[PDB]
Amino acid sequence: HLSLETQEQIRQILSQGHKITFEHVDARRFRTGSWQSCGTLHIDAESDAISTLEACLVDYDGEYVRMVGIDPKGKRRVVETIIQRPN
Ligand code: NI
């Protein structure tokens, strides 16, 4: 049940011609910033982003999940936004 805001953030990234990678981390590895990707890297379509995020939320329920907007030129990380925290 993605919020309006989460979806707007997805659109904001894609509208820049940037690509989305979702990442997850458990509380222990959150301590050291040791995130890992979930799903396909460098998503370029909202449908794919929503599908992937919903999958990541289920698959890593209990972890942090965040969205990373990436400039395709040089794979520069532009923005990171936490979507879910541990429960
Ligand atoms: Ni839901």
Swiss-Prot record:
GO terms for molecular function: ATP binding; ATP hydrolysis activity. Transmembrane segments: none annotated. Keywords: ATP-binding, Nucleotide-binding. The keyword Cell division does not apply. Belongs to the RuBisCO activase family. Activation of RuBisCO (ribulose-1,5-bisohosphate carboxylase/oxygenase; EC 4.1.1.39) involves the ATP-dependent carboxylation of the epsilon-amino group of lysine leading to a carbamate structure. This is Ribulose bisphosphate carboxylase/oxygenase activase. It comes from Nostoc sp. (strain PCC 7120 / SAG 25.82 / UTEX 2576).
